[PDB]
Amino acid sequence: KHHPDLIFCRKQAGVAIGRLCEKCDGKCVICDSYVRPCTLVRICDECNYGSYQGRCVICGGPGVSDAYYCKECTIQEKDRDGCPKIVNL
Amino acid sequence: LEHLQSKYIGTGHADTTKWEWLVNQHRDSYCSYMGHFDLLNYFAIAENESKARVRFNLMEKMLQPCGPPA
Amino acid sequence: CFICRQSFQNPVVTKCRHYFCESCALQHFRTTPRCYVCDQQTNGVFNP
Amino acid sequence: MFLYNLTLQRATGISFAIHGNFSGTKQQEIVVSRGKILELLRPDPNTGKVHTLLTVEVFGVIRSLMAFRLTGGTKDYIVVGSDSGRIVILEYQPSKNMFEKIHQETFGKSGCRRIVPGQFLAVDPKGRAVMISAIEKQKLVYILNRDAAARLTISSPLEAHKANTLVYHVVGVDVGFENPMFACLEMDYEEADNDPTGEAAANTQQTLTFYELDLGLNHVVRKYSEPLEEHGNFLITVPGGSDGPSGVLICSENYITYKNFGDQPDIRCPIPRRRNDLDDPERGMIFVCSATHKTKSMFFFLAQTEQGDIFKITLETDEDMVTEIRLKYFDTVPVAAAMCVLKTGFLFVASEFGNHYLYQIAHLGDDDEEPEFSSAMPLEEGDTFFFQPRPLKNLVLVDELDSLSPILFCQIADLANEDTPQLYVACGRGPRSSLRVLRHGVSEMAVSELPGNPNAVWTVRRHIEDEFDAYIIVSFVNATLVLSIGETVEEVTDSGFLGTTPTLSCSLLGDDALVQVYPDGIRHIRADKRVNEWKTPGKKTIVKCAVNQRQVVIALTGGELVYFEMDPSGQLNEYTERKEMSADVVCMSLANVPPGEQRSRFLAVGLVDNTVRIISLDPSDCLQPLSMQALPAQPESLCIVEMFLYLNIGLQNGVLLRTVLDPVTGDLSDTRTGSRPVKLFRVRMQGQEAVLAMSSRSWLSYSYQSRFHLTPLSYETLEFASGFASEQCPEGIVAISTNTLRILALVFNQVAFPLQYTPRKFVIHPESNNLIIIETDHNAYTEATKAQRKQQMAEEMVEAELAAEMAAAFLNENLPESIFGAPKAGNGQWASVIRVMNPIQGNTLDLVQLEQNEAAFSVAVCRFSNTGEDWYVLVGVAKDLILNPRSVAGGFVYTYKLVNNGEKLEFLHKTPVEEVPAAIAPFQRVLIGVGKLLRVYDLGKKKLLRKCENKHIANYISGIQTIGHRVIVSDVQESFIWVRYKRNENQLIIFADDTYPRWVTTASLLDYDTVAGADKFGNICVVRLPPNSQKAEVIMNYHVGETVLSLQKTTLIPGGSESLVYTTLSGGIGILVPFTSHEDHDFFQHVEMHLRSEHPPLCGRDHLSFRSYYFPVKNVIDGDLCEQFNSMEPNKQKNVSEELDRTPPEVSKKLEDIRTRY
Ligand SMILES: [Zn+2]
Ligand SMILES: [Zn+2]
Ligand SMILES: [Zn+2]
């Protein structure tokens, strides 16, 4: 369900909280699964602060729900990898 | 690949030298011996050595891993 | 004392799910390691 | 199978130490972290003994731990950056005695890698930012300010990842209310790799970069950069503002350069060496441990040199530049890993080996009997002020808590007469080395016995004001004895209860008139033996005594209880109100009266007609038995104790019935416990009341908060049970046997016998059965080398006057190891001392010395292979024993005759070899493994004749366990390789190979094909061989979190399960029990699955990460996590019981069964 392009930031996560839209709600932010969503998503930057306020960290809809890492990704601890909010390049 | 992964410790390719990989492995081993509390205690209580002297020896061995390069 | 069908006072149940009195549980624990239910492993439980 | 592993002994060596106002008040909490566990003490410093306020396990190793307080924050929050990326900042609340996590900042992947930040973590002095940095190329500064509710106003961290900039030491400088700064000793290691000849590697120099972080700009830039040619081993920062200059003192070899970021002078304070120091001058005096003890205005600096003497330093900077730091050796200090000097008589020095010292300040800290080396003090640029080992005049070490770390050798056996086996852990370095033999029994901290075996031993004190039992009346029918409860209980004639006749009860019930139930009746007995003995109800002796604060019901046969009521003078006078029970009262007790109550609400006596009669002890309602706790069997005692209250009748059979001790009659519920009569009375254990069902299985119905639960205790066997209160513990359960009292903590006595060198290998003689241990202090000056160097220094400095007398004083008395640090140097020099301590006495009955460059690698005193059953000891001494790099002369295997059946280490001869024979065992001949060469030689006293030598091993032979024509040997590469050593065929062929690469440092044969290995990374792996170049399958694997020194698959506890006892170098000892019960293993797995969700680990690395940090975990059950689930809260315990589909009391009973299964 992923793409070879569209890297997000690869920048270390801070206090700006991730946020999911309805069009891709419930999926994981990394492997897009639905099994035990464990860890809150932090998006490291002005990915939340400013123009993209309350927006999707995935495709681009109106962000309504807190984005979660799943327990399968936090088994290898992919939650510390950084910002998953997509910046188009 | 990724730019941050290239900036991360452990980036290597087929063009990476064996001596450079061994130097990076020795630097990572010195960093792991500095970080581990049990391994540093085992390295310090082996002889009549101080903890600050062992830390200075580890800081010297970090540069000594790149000390005699190719 | 379900076999005797007497009055019930200070109830206590053994480990083999046999409901009796407290003194009846003491008498069962002093008598046998098994209870009177199905001779299961009551282990002399004279407990409340 | 699955291994329900539980650590019986915690690790004693503190991996780190912090201190401050972490208790939220003026109580300076100091937390010593022993790795995965941290104990914080915030007790009274005037007590003199360390008392830990809290203990926390995080299931992870802290890469850098600190404790800092915010601006206005009275509670110092602890910030721990562990191996995992979750750096946990937690404010410690001492009301719950726990650290509530204000934040858990995520940084990166697990482990303290080269680029994983958090290896060096510090905070600003205003509590505004925290910097966590890696070894190199990674640094972060999180802006964590104070919120509106004084909460963690954390921010995203500014990154200071400078490429190949290794930070030797980083410290947050005190900038006050302005923009803070942090000074790091950055070293550009990129030029080292750029220069292929190493010219820039040699020309590289450190630079203290003080980077200032403008908080208004929210950006950190390198403000100051002071380069130093000498590398910074450690640095101590002078506190700026009103506490002194804003400078830092970078330490080097006899040079502490104090300088500030600005126009300040680089004051190079010389470290004051000892007057005629016997140590070599290669060991430069550097600040190994530094602590700035600050007053209201100024601050002194206590530093330890390479010798380690405590040197207090003043500061005559005069607020312009660093000028003078009067470093005078105030006291000689022992071998300490760290030292922190707080206020109000607190100075905690954590020892690497020996006893960690907590000190109380006596003088002002400048009381130096040695010379003073100021920074403004001139010298000849070759030495400093000759500050010899001074007396401890500045402060006195009020506590010396002995630590088992570094526990090198171990020998656990039940040879000594004790309630538990004595485990002798040989530990320590050089002359500061000892073997601590600990025997438990199960809190055997002190040994004390009552005088004889009297009828009753109760505190018939002088009055009610005598809280300590100055005269406990151990009164029998023949006579009476007075015992002092200070763990010095004996017999004396100061009881005063008139116990010449049979005194059944004797206790200070009145204000000064002790109630004594005796054959005369009820006696009011004073501090002296003035017993006004009123008659009881009837002419019989006092069988039962329900003694209260006002009315004591003395019950004779027939249940007739005369009420000795309190008169206006405080004496007990027998009133005319007496009531008879159903039968003869065996024993009685009265519940405690309230503050407004005139007497006891319920005094109950246990009659022989299976009942306990409880009456109101007030004079308006006396002799009226209302509550009837009807016993299920024939009652042997009664106990009517608070927590409404419970009145119980305990029987000779297995049922004790408790009802409500009140004016209303309760329901007599009969609970169960050894075929002995019960002696339920008032007892004290952990602040909760209990009624003792006296039996061979001594159970206690603990009535903690109106709920009586009866179970036994984990003490030694006995026949009766009572309370215990002495100098060892305030409240415990004394399982009273025949002239014996098994202690139950409802602690092991350790004696440390010293050794000459650092302990290497503890072995036992075959004939003597005595501990002929070998101690090897390698890479240091020996005893003979130290004596030769002292004589050489005497001959050198005798050439002069008073210098010859100083030379003789330097020869006679150098810096001692326990006083001012051991003077020792050299690389190939090595002390070897074989000390044969006796099987009972820790003193050495024999001493054997080796060469001054020879280290005793192994100790093996057993029967010789070439000779008969006589004990011939093979002692391997590696001459020129230098660790780094690989330098050794050769291994001399001295064959010793071991005279007096091993009690005299008489060396017969020696056999030399070029390599080091670290392993010497008997093999059907003797297998001696000299590195990769193992030879089967005859074990002769004169010389060895080798027959078959195999040099096909990979690296070395760490240790080989033989199970009969097969020996599994550990190596530096392979964890265990099994070679079928066919000594009948005179050959060795490797029947089993190894696939898992591990530097296994221990061996244990669980079966004929099971071999255990404790790797260098601290992982215990048990591998069973396959049935019938093939490896053995690792059946069990776990990571203990510390490097385990030794392991042995044996039943360590008395009876129980055949577990595996593992001893680590940090002082930890654990037992891994192979649980063959699959249902109990599944219940423990479900409890662990509930507990991993209910209780998260504080380090950020989980229990799975802690057990599988190096290699993956298998066949292990976490009894430590089971103990944490038992230590969880009440609502979390109810949720965990719902998750495990059971009860919390049932889970606690299962945990107690797992503890009793051993
Ligand atoms: Zn996922
Ligand atoms: Zn979306
Ligand atoms: Zn981002």
CSV table of N, CA, C and O in Angstrom, one decimal, chain D residues 854-933:
chain,number,residue,atom,x,y,z
D,854,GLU,N,54.2,-12.9,38.6
D,854,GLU,CA,53.4,-14.1,38.4
D,854,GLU,C,52.0,-13.9,39.0
D,854,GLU,O,51.9,-13.6,40.2
D,855,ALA,N,51.0,-14.2,38.2
D,855,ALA,CA,49.6,-14.2,38.7
D,855,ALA,C,49.1,-15.6,38.8
D,855,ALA,O,49.3,-16.4,37.9
D,856,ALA,N,48.4,-15.9,39.9
D,856,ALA,CA,47.8,-17.3,40.1
D,856,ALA,C,46.6,-17.4,39.2
D,856,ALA,O,45.5,-16.8,39.6
D,857,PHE,N,46.7,-18.0,38.1
D,857,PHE,CA,45.6,-18.1,37.2
D,857,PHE,C,44.5,-19.1,37.7
D,857,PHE,O,43.3,-18.8,37.6
D,858,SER,N,44.9,-20.2,38.2
D,858,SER,CA,43.9,-21.3,38.7
D,858,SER,C,44.3,-21.9,40.0
D,858,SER,O,45.5,-21.8,40.3
D,859,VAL,N,43.4,-22.4,40.8
D,859,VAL,CA,43.6,-23.1,42.0
D,859,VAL,C,42.9,-24.4,41.9
D,859,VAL,O,41.7,-24.5,41.6
D,860,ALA,N,43.7,-25.5,42.2
D,860,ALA,CA,43.2,-26.8,42.1
D,860,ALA,C,44.0,-27.7,43.1
D,860,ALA,O,45.1,-28.2,42.8
D,861,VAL,N,43.4,-28.0,44.3
D,861,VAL,CA,44.0,-28.8,45.3
D,861,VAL,C,43.2,-30.0,45.4
D,861,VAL,O,42.2,-30.1,46.2
D,862,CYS,N,43.6,-31.1,44.7
D,862,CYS,CA,42.8,-32.4,44.8
D,862,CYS,C,43.8,-33.5,44.7
D,862,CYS,O,45.0,-33.3,44.9
D,863,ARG,N,43.3,-34.7,44.6
D,863,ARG,CA,44.2,-35.9,44.6
D,863,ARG,C,44.9,-36.0,43.2
D,863,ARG,O,44.3,-35.7,42.2
D,864,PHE,N,46.2,-36.3,43.3
D,864,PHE,CA,47.0,-36.3,42.1
D,864,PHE,C,46.7,-37.5,41.2
D,864,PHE,O,46.3,-38.6,41.7
D,865,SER,N,46.8,-37.3,39.9
D,865,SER,CA,46.5,-38.4,38.9
D,865,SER,C,47.7,-39.4,38.9
D,865,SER,O,47.4,-40.6,38.9
D,866,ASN,N,48.9,-39.0,38.9
D,866,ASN,CA,50.1,-39.9,39.0
D,866,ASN,C,50.2,-40.5,40.3
D,866,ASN,O,50.6,-41.7,40.4
D,867,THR,N,50.0,-39.8,41.4
D,867,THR,CA,50.2,-40.3,42.7
D,867,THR,C,48.8,-40.9,43.2
D,867,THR,O,47.9,-41.0,42.4
D,868,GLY,N,48.7,-41.2,44.5
D,868,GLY,CA,47.4,-41.8,45.0
D,868,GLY,C,46.4,-40.8,45.3
D,868,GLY,O,46.1,-39.8,44.5
D,869,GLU,N,45.7,-41.0,46.4
D,869,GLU,CA,44.6,-40.1,46.9
D,869,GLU,C,45.1,-38.9,47.7
D,869,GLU,O,44.2,-38.2,48.2
D,870,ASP,N,46.4,-38.8,47.9
D,870,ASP,CA,46.9,-37.7,48.6
D,870,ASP,C,46.7,-36.4,47.8
D,870,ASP,O,46.9,-36.3,46.6
D,871,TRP,N,46.4,-35.3,48.5
D,871,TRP,CA,46.1,-34.0,47.9
D,871,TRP,C,47.4,-33.4,47.4
D,871,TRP,O,48.2,-32.9,48.3
D,872,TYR,N,47.6,-33.3,46.1
D,872,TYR,CA,48.7,-32.6,45.5
D,872,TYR,C,48.1,-31.5,44.7
D,872,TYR,O,47.3,-31.7,43.8
D,873,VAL,N,48.5,-30.3,45.0
D,873,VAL,CA,47.9,-29.1,44.5
D,873,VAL,C,48.6,-28.6,43.2
D,873,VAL,O,49.8,-28.5,43.3
D,874,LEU,N,47.9,-28.4,42.1
D,874,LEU,CA,48.5,-27.8,40.9
D,874,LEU,C,48.1,-26.4,40.8
D,874,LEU,O,47.0,-26.0,40.6
D,875,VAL,N,49.1,-25.5,41.0
D,875,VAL,CA,48.9,-24.1,41.0
D,875,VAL,C,49.6,-23.4,39.8
D,875,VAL,O,50.9,-23.5,39.8
D,876,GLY,N,48.9,-22.8,38.9
D,876,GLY,CA,49.5,-22.2,37.7
D,876,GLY,C,49.7,-20.8,38.0
D,876,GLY,O,48.8,-20.0,38.3
D,877,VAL,N,51.0,-20.4,37.8
D,877,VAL,CA,51.4,-19.0,37.9
D,877,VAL,C,51.9,-18.5,36.6
D,877,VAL,O,52.9,-19.0,36.1
D,878,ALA,N,51.2,-17.5,36.0
D,878,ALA,CA,51.7,-16.9,34.8
D,878,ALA,C,52.6,-15.7,35.1
D,878,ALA,O,52.1,-14.7,35.6
D,879,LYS,N,53.9,-15.9,34.7
D,879,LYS,CA,54.8,-14.8,35.0
D,879,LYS,C,54.7,-13.8,33.9
D,879,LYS,O,54.3,-14.0,32.8
D,880,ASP,N,55.2,-12.5,34.3
D,880,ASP,CA,55.1,-11.3,33.5
D,880,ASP,C,53.6,-11.0,33.0
D,880,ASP,O,53.4,-10.7,31.9
D,881,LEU,N,52.7,-11.2,33.9
D,881,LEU,CA,51.3,-11.3,33.6
D,881,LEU,C,50.8,-9.8,33.3
D,881,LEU,O,50.4,-9.1,34.2
D,882,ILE,N,50.8,-9.5,32.0
D,882,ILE,CA,50.3,-8.2,31.6
D,882,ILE,C,49.0,-8.4,30.7
D,882,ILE,O,49.0,-9.3,29.8
D,883,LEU,N,47.9,-7.7,31.1
D,883,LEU,CA,46.7,-7.9,30.4
D,883,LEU,C,46.6,-7.3,29.0
D,883,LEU,O,46.4,-8.0,28.0
D,884,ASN,N,46.8,-6.0,29.0
D,884,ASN,CA,46.7,-5.3,27.7
D,884,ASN,C,48.1,-4.6,27.4
D,884,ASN,O,48.5,-3.8,28.2
D,885,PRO,N,48.8,-5.1,26.4
D,885,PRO,CA,48.4,-6.1,25.4
D,885,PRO,C,48.8,-7.5,25.9
D,885,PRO,O,49.1,-7.7,27.0
D,886,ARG,N,48.8,-8.5,24.9
D,886,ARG,CA,49.0,-9.9,25.3
D,886,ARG,C,50.5,-10.0,25.6
D,886,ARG,O,51.3,-10.1,24.6
D,887,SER,N,50.9,-10.1,26.8
D,887,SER,CA,52.3,-10.2,27.3
D,887,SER,C,52.3,-11.1,28.5
D,887,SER,O,51.7,-10.7,29.5
D,888,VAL,N,53.0,-12.2,28.4
D,888,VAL,CA,53.2,-13.1,29.6
D,888,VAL,C,54.5,-13.9,29.3
D,888,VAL,O,54.8,-14.2,28.2
D,889,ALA,N,55.2,-14.2,30.4
D,889,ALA,CA,56.4,-14.9,30.2
D,889,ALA,C,56.1,-16.4,30.0
D,889,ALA,O,56.5,-17.0,29.0
D,890,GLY,N,55.4,-17.0,31.0
D,890,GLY,CA,55.1,-18.4,30.9
D,890,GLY,C,54.4,-18.9,32.1
D,890,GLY,O,54.4,-18.2,33.2
D,891,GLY,N,53.7,-20.1,32.0
D,891,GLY,CA,53.0,-20.6,33.1
D,891,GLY,C,53.8,-21.7,33.8
D,891,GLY,O,54.1,-22.8,33.2
D,892,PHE,N,54.1,-21.4,35.0
D,892,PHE,CA,54.8,-22.4,35.9
D,892,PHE,C,53.6,-23.1,36.7
D,892,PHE,O,53.0,-22.5,37.5
D,893,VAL,N,53.4,-24.4,36.4
D,893,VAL,CA,52.5,-25.2,37.2
D,893,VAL,C,53.2,-25.8,38.3
D,893,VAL,O,53.9,-26.8,38.2
D,894,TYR,N,53.2,-25.2,39.5
D,894,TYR,CA,53.8,-25.7,40.7
D,894,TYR,C,53.0,-26.8,41.2
D,894,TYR,O,51.8,-26.7,41.5
D,895,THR,N,53.6,-28.0,41.3
D,895,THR,CA,53.0,-29.1,42.0
D,895,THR,C,53.4,-29.0,43.5
D,895,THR,O,54.6,-29.0,43.8
D,896,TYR,N,52.4,-29.0,44.4
D,896,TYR,CA,52.6,-28.8,45.8
D,896,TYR,C,52.1,-30.1,46.6
D,896,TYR,O,51.1,-30.6,46.3
D,897,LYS,N,52.9,-30.5,47.6
D,897,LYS,CA,52.6,-31.7,48.3
D,897,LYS,C,51.4,-31.5,49.3
D,897,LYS,O,50.8,-32.4,49.6
D,898,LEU,N,51.1,-30.2,49.6
D,898,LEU,CA,50.0,-29.8,50.5
D,898,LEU,C,50.1,-30.5,51.8
D,898,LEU,O,49.2,-31.3,52.2
D,899,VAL,N,51.1,-30.1,52.6
D,899,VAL,CA,51.4,-30.7,53.9
D,899,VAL,C,50.3,-30.4,54.9
D,899,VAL,O,49.5,-29.5,54.7
D,900,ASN,N,50.3,-31.2,56.0
D,900,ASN,CA,49.3,-31.2,57.1
D,900,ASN,C,47.9,-31.5,56.5
D,900,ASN,O,46.9,-30.9,56.8
D,901,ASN,N,47.9,-32.5,55.5
D,901,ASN,CA,46.7,-32.9,54.7
D,901,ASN,C,46.1,-31.7,54.0
D,901,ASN,O,44.9,-31.6,53.9
D,902,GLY,N,46.9,-30.8,53.5
D,902,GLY,CA,46.5,-29.6,52.8
D,902,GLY,C,46.5,-28.3,53.7
D,902,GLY,O,46.2,-27.2,53.1
D,903,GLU,N,46.7,-28.4,55.0
D,903,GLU,CA,46.7,-27.2,55.8
D,903,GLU,C,48.1,-26.5,55.8
D,903,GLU,O,48.2,-25.4,56.4
D,904,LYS,N,49.1,-27.0,55.1
D,904,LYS,CA,50.3,-26.3,54.8
D,904,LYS,C,50.6,-26.4,53.3
D,904,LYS,O,50.9,-27.5,52.8
D,905,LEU,N,50.7,-25.3,52.7
D,905,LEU,CA,50.9,-25.2,51.2
D,905,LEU,C,52.4,-25.4,50.9
D,905,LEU,O,53.1,-24.5,50.7
D,906,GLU,N,52.8,-26.7,51.0
D,906,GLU,CA,54.2,-27.0,50.8
D,906,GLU,C,54.4,-27.4,49.3
D,906,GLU,O,54.0,-28.4,48.8
D,907,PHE,N,55.1,-26.5,48.6
D,907,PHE,CA,55.4,-26.7,47.2
D,907,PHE,C,56.4,-27.7,47.0
D,907,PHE,O,57.6,-27.6,47.4
D,908,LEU,N,56.1,-28.8,46.3
D,908,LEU,CA,57.0,-29.9,46.0
D,908,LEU,C,58.0,-29.4,44.9
D,908,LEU,O,59.2,-29.3,45.1
D,909,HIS,N,57.5,-29.2,43.7
D,909,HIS,CA,58.3,-28.8,42.6
D,909,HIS,C,57.4,-28.0,41.6
D,909,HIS,O,56.3,-27.6,41.9
D,910,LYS,N,57.9,-27.8,40.4
D,910,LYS,CA,57.2,-27.1,39.4
D,910,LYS,C,57.5,-27.6,38.0
D,910,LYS,O,58.5,-28.2,37.8
D,911,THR,N,56.5,-27.5,37.1
D,911,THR,CA,56.7,-27.8,35.7
D,911,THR,C,56.4,-26.6,34.9
D,911,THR,O,55.3,-26.0,35.0
D,912,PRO,N,57.3,-26.2,34.0
D,912,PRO,CA,57.1,-24.9,33.3
D,912,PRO,C,56.5,-25.2,31.9
D,912,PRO,O,56.6,-26.3,31.3
D,913,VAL,N,55.8,-24.2,31.4
D,913,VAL,CA,55.3,-24.2,30.0
D,913,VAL,C,55.3,-22.7,29.5
D,913,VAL,O,55.3,-21.8,30.3
D,914,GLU,N,55.4,-22.6,28.2
D,914,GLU,CA,55.5,-21.3,27.6
D,914,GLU,C,54.1,-20.6,27.6
D,914,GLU,O,54.1,-19.4,27.8
D,915,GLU,N,53.0,-21.3,27.5
D,915,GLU,CA,51.7,-20.7,27.5
D,915,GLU,C,51.2,-20.7,29.0
D,915,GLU,O,51.9,-21.1,29.9
D,916,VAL,N,50.0,-20.3,29.2
D,916,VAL,CA,49.4,-20.2,30.5
D,916,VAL,C,48.4,-21.3,30.7
D,916,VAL,O,47.4,-21.4,30.0
D,917,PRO,N,48.7,-22.3,31.5
D,917,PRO,CA,47.7,-23.4,31.8
D,917,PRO,C,46.6,-23.0,32.8
D,917,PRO,O,46.7,-23.2,34.0
D,918,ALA,N,45.6,-22.3,32.2
D,918,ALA,CA,44.5,-21.8,33.0
D,918,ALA,C,43.6,-22.9,33.5
D,918,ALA,O,42.8,-22.7,34.4
D,919,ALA,N,43.6,-24.1,32.8
D,919,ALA,CA,42.8,-25.2,33.2
D,919,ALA,C,43.7,-26.4,33.6
D,919,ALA,O,44.5,-26.8,32.7
D,920,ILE,N,43.5,-27.0,34.7
D,920,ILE,CA,44.2,-28.2,35.1
D,920,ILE,C,43.2,-29.1,35.9
D,920,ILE,O,42.8,-28.8,37.0
D,921,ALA,N,42.8,-30.2,35.3
D,921,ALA,CA,41.8,-31.1,35.9
D,921,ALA,C,42.3,-32.5,35.7
D,921,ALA,O,43.1,-32.8,34.9
D,922,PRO,N,41.7,-33.5,36.5
D,922,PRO,CA,42.0,-34.9,36.2
D,922,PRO,C,41.1,-35.5,35.2
D,922,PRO,O,39.9,-35.2,35.1
D,923,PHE,N,41.7,-36.3,34.3
D,923,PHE,CA,41.0,-36.9,33.1
D,923,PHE,C,41.3,-38.3,33.1
D,923,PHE,O,42.3,-38.7,32.5
D,924,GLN,N,40.5,-39.1,33.8
D,924,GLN,CA,40.6,-40.6,33.9
D,924,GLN,C,41.9,-41.1,34.4
D,924,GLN,O,42.8,-41.5,33.6
D,925,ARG,N,44.9,-39.6,33.4
D,925,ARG,CA,46.0,-38.6,33.7
D,925,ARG,C,45.4,-37.3,34.1
D,925,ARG,O,44.3,-37.3,34.8
D,926,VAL,N,46.0,-36.2,33.7
D,926,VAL,CA,45.5,-34.9,34.0
D,926,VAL,C,45.5,-34.1,32.8
D,926,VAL,O,46.5,-34.0,32.1
D,927,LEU,N,44.3,-33.5,32.4
D,927,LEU,CA,44.2,-32.6,31.3
D,927,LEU,C,44.6,-31.2,31.7
D,927,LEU,O,44.0,-30.6,32.6
D,928,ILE,N,45.7,-30.7,31.1
D,928,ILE,CA,46.2,-29.3,31.4
D,928,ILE,C,46.0,-28.6,30.1
D,928,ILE,O,46.7,-28.9,29.1
D,929,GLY,N,45.2,-27.6,30.1
D,929,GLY,CA,45.0,-26.8,28.9
D,929,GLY,C,45.8,-25.5,28.9
D,929,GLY,O,45.4,-24.5,29.5
D,930,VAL,N,46.9,-25.5,28.2
D,930,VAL,CA,47.7,-24.3,28.1
D,930,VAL,C,47.3,-23.6,26.8
D,930,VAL,O,47.9,-23.8,25.7
D,931,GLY,N,46.3,-22.7,26.9
D,931,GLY,CA,45.8,-22.0,25.7
D,931,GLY,C,45.0,-22.9,24.8
D,931,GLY,O,44.0,-23.5,25.3
D,932,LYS,N,45.5,-23.1,23.6
D,932,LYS,CA,44.8,-24.0,22.6
D,932,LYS,C,45.4,-25.4,22.7
D,932,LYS,O,44.9,-26.2,22.0
D,933,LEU,N,46.4,-25.6,23.5
D,933,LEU,CA,47.0,-26.9,23.7
D,933,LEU,C,46.6,-27.6,25.0
D,933,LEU,O,46.8,-27.0,26.1
